[PDB]
Design a protein around this ligand. Structure first.
Ligand SMILES: Nc1ncnc2c1ncn2[C@@H]1O[C@H](COP(=O)(O)OP(=O)(O)OP(=O)(O)O)[C@@H](O)[C@H]1O
Ligand SMILES: [Mg+2]
Length: 283
């Protein structure tokens, strides 16, 4: 691990535990001694580009990586600014931002629970139609809130939706720094998420772009894996509608809503979050 140790201090903040360590940043549970509250701290830390120094600052693994490291840092800042525009229970709440240690940090609300990806891996039996229908209203609300301010998410999958102990969802992360690094470094595999990204993200984007990815999330919850990669579908569409597969315990209404969100062409999908929510009515 390249993480800061329990007990490390950023003035009033104290690191408690590194709870997420990925290729592009680290997430810590931390404590604010001034306000006496637990928070999360997200640290930009692209492991392909940077390493942890002895004094716990971050340094370049090679001098050739500097421009890409800086571009990722700029995208990390821009993502924090985007999340700072909102005060919504389903969107990661940003408390503070600062630069230190040769990198950057976001202080955010600390959420209970774990990711949807972990819940699906660890407790798939909890995820049935009734649970999905309880998840959708607050998840629709969070996504629509982004859209109504004129933005798109563009990185939805199971990996970046937190499911709190209350079962309410939170969108944690838009992948901005990761995607910028991938574009600049020709590491195309870290930009789009295979099976979640629709055809128009491969090179015309709008709310329907996020709606497809949400359909892919729901498809994964229902049958256990995402639909075929959208570029492959654009050549020979091998997607079998869920209404035909008929997984046990799922209504045609929910299944058809997923199939419609997964329509190959943007114009054939629900065009807004409100339109997709309407498909689940009439039951
Ligand atoms: N604000 C937050 N509050 C609480 N937990 C958070 C917050 N932000 C991120 N997390 C957690 O950070 C982790 C980020 O996942 P990541 O893949 O980067 O790390 P990981 O160590 O591989 O963890 P995992 O086994 O969950 O994949 C997730 O487990 C997620 O729940
Ligand atoms: Mg992980």
């Amino acid at each position: 691990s390249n993480s800061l140790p329990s007990g490390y201090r950023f003035n009033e903040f104290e690191i408690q535990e590194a709870i997420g360590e990925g290729g592009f940043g680290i997430v810590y549970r931390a404590y604010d001694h001034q306000l006496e509250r637990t928070i999360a701290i997200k640290e930009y830390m692209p492991t392909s580009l940077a390493k942890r120094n002895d004094d716990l600052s971050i340094g370049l693994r090679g001098e050739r990586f500097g421009k890409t490291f800086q571009a990722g840092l700029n995208s990390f800042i821009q993502e924090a600014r985007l999340l700072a525009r909102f005060s919504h229970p389903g969107l990661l709440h940003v408390l503070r931002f600062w630069e230190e240690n040769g990198t950057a940090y976001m202080g955010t609300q600390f959420y209970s629970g774990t990711t949807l990806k972990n819940l699906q891996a660890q407790q798939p039996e909890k995820i049935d139609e009734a649970w999905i229908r309880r998840l959708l209203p607050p998840l629709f609300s969070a996504i629509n809130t982004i859209h109504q301010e004129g933005y798109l998410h563009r990185d939805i999958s199971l990996d970046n939706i937190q499911i709190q102990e209350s079962q309410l969802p939170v969108l944690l992360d838009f992948g901005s720094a990761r995607k910028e690094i991938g574009n600049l470094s020709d590491e195309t595999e870290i930009v789009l998420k295979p099976g979640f990204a629709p055809i128009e993200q491969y090179t015309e984007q709008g709310p329907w772009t996020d709606i497809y990815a949400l359909g892919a999330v729901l498809h994964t919850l229902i049958v256990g894996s995402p639909p075929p990669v959208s570029v492959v579908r654009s050549i020979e569409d091998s997607y079998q509608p869920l209404t035909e597969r008929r997984p046990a315990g799922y209504s045609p209404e929910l299944l058809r809503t997923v199939d419609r969100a997964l329509a190959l062409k943007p114009e054939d999908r629900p065009q807004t979050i409100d339109e997709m929510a309407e498909l689940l009515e009439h039951h």
